[PDB]
Amino acid sequence: GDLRNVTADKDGVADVSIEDSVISLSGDHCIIGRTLVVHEKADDLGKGGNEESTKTGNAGSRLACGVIGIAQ
Amino acid sequence: GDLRNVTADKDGVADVSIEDSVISLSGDHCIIGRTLVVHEKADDLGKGGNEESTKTGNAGSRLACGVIGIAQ
Amino acid sequence: GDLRNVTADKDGVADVSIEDSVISLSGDHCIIGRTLVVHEKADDLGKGGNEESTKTGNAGSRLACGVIGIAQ
């Protein structure tokens, strides 16, 4: 036994089935301006930092110990 | 036994079924302006910070120990 | 036994079924202005901070120990 996830189906138009998952949606991110200024200083961002990841994801830029400055 | 998640179906138009999951939706994020100024200073953001992740996600930029400055 | 989540169905147009889950929705986030100014200083944001996550999510930018400055 121990099926742990089962999605049966016989007919049906445009049926949706979401079992144990993670869904994330965003929209538009407009920025209108006339002057953008960024000043930054960093000195110590990692001193033996361990990091793990298993079955992860994101809809953008991925980084560890970053000084991006201006992202998008 | 121990099925833990079961979604049966026979017919039906546009049926939706959401078992143990995480859903997150956002909208638009307009910003209108004429001058954007950012000044930043960082000195110590990680000194042995452990971090784990399993089956995670996000709809944007992912980072650990960041000084983004201006995101979007 | 121990099914723990069961959603049966026979017919039906546009039927929705939400078992043990987490749903989060937001709307629009307009900001209208003529001058945006941000000054920031940070000195110590993590000194051995452990962090875990399992089956999490969000509809935006994810970060740990951040100095974002101006998000969106």
Curated annotation (Swiss-Prot), chains A, B, C:
Effect of residue 53 to N: In ALS1; reduced metal binding; increases tendency to form fibrillar aggregates
Protein name: Superoxide dismutase [Cu-Zn]
Modified residues (N6-succinyllysine): 10, 41, 55
Note: The protein (both wild-type and ALS1 variants) has a tendency to form fibrillar aggregates in the absence of the intramolecular disulfide bond or of bound zinc ions. These aggregates may have cytotoxic effects. Zinc binding promotes dimerization and stabilizes the native form.
Record: residues binding Cu cation: 39
Post-translational modification (record): Such modification might only occur in extreme conditions and additional experimental evidence is required.
Positions bearing N6-acetyllysine: 41, 55
Annotated consequence of substituting residue 2 to A: Loss of zinc binding and enhanced tendency to form aggregates
Organism: Homo sapiens
Chain positions with Phosphoserine modification: 17, 21, 24, 26
Function: Destroys radicals which are normally produced within the cells and which are toxic to biological systems.
Effect of residue 9 to A: In ALS1; does not seem to be linked with a decrease in activity
Binding site for Zn(2+): 2
Localization of this protein: Cytoplasm; Nucleus
Resulting phenotype, residue 16 to M: In ALS1; increases tendency to form fibrillar aggregates
